[PDB]
Structure formats: structure tokens, C-alpha cells
């Protein structure tokens, strides 16, 4: 099946998932002197107090943290939302340099990781039923650049030795996801897709401006994992990310000036 390989890449998906090439797919680049300041756009609003976490798995692509979303717990709205997102989970796309990794760009820049935390629309009951609606994601995207630590990312970093294959998981309760944001809130938005199959077109796409830093040995033991199941020949999990799409009809539309 799918993967970031030579031969079952991102250039591949198209074939058993023709939507690759439709109308609103992700990533884009986002061009900052083309992007439209609205008015309009309210700020975010993030309530992540009573965020449940539960577990931590390596799904063969990335890792997932995943989060109770049976209650109104950890909630996304404001911005350019209507109705609640409840969050689901949240995982990284990352390079096997500091140069790349990142799925969006801005002005062709790409940074060593992107942060993705996945909400799903309350009003539509669960997150099947939402992934198939034009409203029915909101993904808060966050740059990394390679600087200093963060402190609130290592709880993560620490477990990935127990979750190097694919497939296994591990126990991951308490931790704070407030630790995470950058200062700034300010974000560009756009309709977009999911970036992996099945690239469904179903995510209002929230991509903040402010990076958050974290360190080379931060980032090391990511690329530390792996593709590939326990007892098969080793890949390292790096490059899991998708190059930019063609915006075509869509607008970029920014919360600031
Ligand atoms: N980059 S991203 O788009 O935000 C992104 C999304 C997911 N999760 C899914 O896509 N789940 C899912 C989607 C549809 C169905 C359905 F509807 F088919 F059942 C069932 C499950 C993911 O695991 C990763 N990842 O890399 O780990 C990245
Ligand atoms: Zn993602």
C-alpha cells in the first residue's frame, strides 16, 4: 500500500485514491504577500484545560497521540469556524534533515516539522461521519524550527523508544497539550484536505505564523523510529511528509496585517 517510498510515494497515491488531483488538496505553499488580511476573522479560541490524553501509537506513517473526544473536553472554535471541533489527536510529519520535513511552506520555506492537532466537528456525531463533510475538520498546523528545547514536547519524546514499530502503542495519560502553542495565535486559513490517503477534502486548514522551537536532539529521536513492523527490515520513519498541491480556486485569507 501507501507509503513515502520510491515506489509507493506521494507521486503514487493517485492511483488507488484519484482525489490527489481535486479541486482543494493539501498541503500549499503559502505566498505571505498574496494571502488577504480579513477583518472579519475572529481569534482563536483554544480550550485545552481539561484535555484528556490516552494513549500513543505508531500507525506505520507517523505517531498518534489520541485523546478522549466522547465529551466537550479539548475544543477548538472561534477563527474561522462555526460550531465546535472536539480534538481527536494530534501527530507530526518530520525530515530526514533540518532543511525539510514540514508539509505547508511559507514563501517556499519549509521548516524541519509540522505540528498537526485534529479536531472534528461536533454537530455531525462522530469523526467518521464528519470526514465526509466539506466543514467537518479543523487542523491547527504548527511550524518547528531546530533552536532551543521544548520543554513541554520531551514527555513525548521520551516514550518513542517503546513505540518504534509499527503497531505498537503505549499508555500516554496526562499530558497537557497547552504545551505545544506558540505565544501568538495569529494564523493563516484556508480549505483544504487531509494530507495523507484517503485525502479527503473535509478540513478548514489553520495554520499559525509563530513556530515553536525545539532542539536537534529533540528532533533526533524522531527520526529514530520506524516504518516498518518489529521483526522486519528496518526504515527509519523520516520524510513522512507530502509536497505542496496546486492552490488552484482558493484563497489564503490571514488573521493579521
Ligand atoms: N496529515 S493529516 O491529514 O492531518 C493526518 C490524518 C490522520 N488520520 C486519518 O486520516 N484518519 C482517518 C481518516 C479517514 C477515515 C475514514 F473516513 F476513511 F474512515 C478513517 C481514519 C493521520 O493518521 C495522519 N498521520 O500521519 O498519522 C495524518
Ligand atoms: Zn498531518
Given at each position: 500500500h501507501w507509503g513515502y517510498g520510491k515506489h509507493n510515494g506521494p507521486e503514487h497515491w493517485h492511483k488507488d485514491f484519484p482525489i490527489a488531483?481535486?479541486?482543494?488538496?493539501?498541503?500549499?505553499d503559502i505566498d505571505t504577500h498574496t494571502a488577504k488580511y480579513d477583518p472579519s476573522?475572529?481569534?482563536?479560541?483554544?480550550?485545552?484545560?481539561?484535555?484528556?490524553?490516552?494513549?500513543?501509537?505508531?500507525?506505520?506513517?507517523?505517531?498518534?497521540?489520541?485523546?478522549?473526544?466522547?465529551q466537550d473536553?479539548?475544543?477548538?472554535?472561534?477563527?474561522p469556524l462555526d460550531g465546535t471541533y472536539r480534538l481527536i489527536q494530534f501527530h507530526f510529519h518530520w525530515g530526514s534533515?533540518?532543511?525539510?520535513?514540514?508539509?505547508?511552506?511559507?514563501?517556499?520555506?519549509?521548516?524541519?516539522?509540522?505540528?498537526?492537532?485534529?479536531?472534528?466537528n461536533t454537530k455531525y456525531g462522530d469523526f467518521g461521519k464528519a470526514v465526509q463533510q466539506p466543514d467537518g475538520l479543523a487542523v491547527l498546523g504548527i511550524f518547528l524550527k531546530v533552536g532551543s528545547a521544548k520543554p513541554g514536547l520531551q514527555k513525548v519524546?521520551?516514550?518513542?523508544?517503546?513505540?518504534?514499530?509499527?503497531?505498537?502503542?503505549?499508555?500516554?495519560?496526562?499530558?497537557?497539550?497547552?504545551?505545544?502553542?506558540?505565544?501568538?495565535?495569529?494564523?493563516?486559513?484556508?480549505?483544504?484536505?487531509?494530507?495523507?490517503?484517503?485525502?479527503?477534502?473535509?478540513?478548514?486548514?489553520?495554520?499559525?505564523?509563530?513556530?515553536?522551537?525545539?532542539?536537534?536532539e529533540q528532533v533526533l529521536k524522531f527520526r529514530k523510529l520506524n516504518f516498518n513492523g518489529e521483526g522486519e527490515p528496518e526504515e527509519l520513519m523520516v520524510?513522512?511528509?507530502?509536497?505542496?498541491?496546486?492552490?488552484?480556486?482558493?484563497?489564503?485569507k490571514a488573521s493579521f496585517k
Open positions: 488531483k481535486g479541486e482543494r488538496q493539501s498541503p500549499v476573522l475572529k481569534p482563536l479560541s483554544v480550550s485545552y484545560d481539561q484535555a484528556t490524553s490516552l494513549r500513543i501509537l505508531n500507525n506505520g506513517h507517523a505517531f498518534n497521540v489520541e485523546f478522549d473526544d466522547s473536553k479539548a475544543v477548538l472554535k472561534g477563527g534533515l533540518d532543511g525539510q520535513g514540514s508539509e505547508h511552506t511559507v514563501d517556499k520555506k519549509k521548516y524541519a516539522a509540522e505540528l498537526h492537532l485534529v479536531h472534528w519524546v521520551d516514550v518513542l523508544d517503546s513505540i518504534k514499530t509499527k503497531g505498537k502503542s503505549a499508555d500516554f495519560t496526562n499530558f497537557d497539550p497547552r504545551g505545544l502553542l506558540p505565544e501568538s495565535l495569529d494564523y493563516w486559513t484556508y480549505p483544504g484536505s487531509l494530507t495523507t490517503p484517503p485525502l479527503l477534502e473535509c478540513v478548514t486548514w489553520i495554520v499559525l505564523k509563530e513556530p515553536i522551537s525545539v532542539s536537534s520524510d513522512n511528509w507530502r509536497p505542496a498541491q496546486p492552490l488552484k480556486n482558493r484563497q489564503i
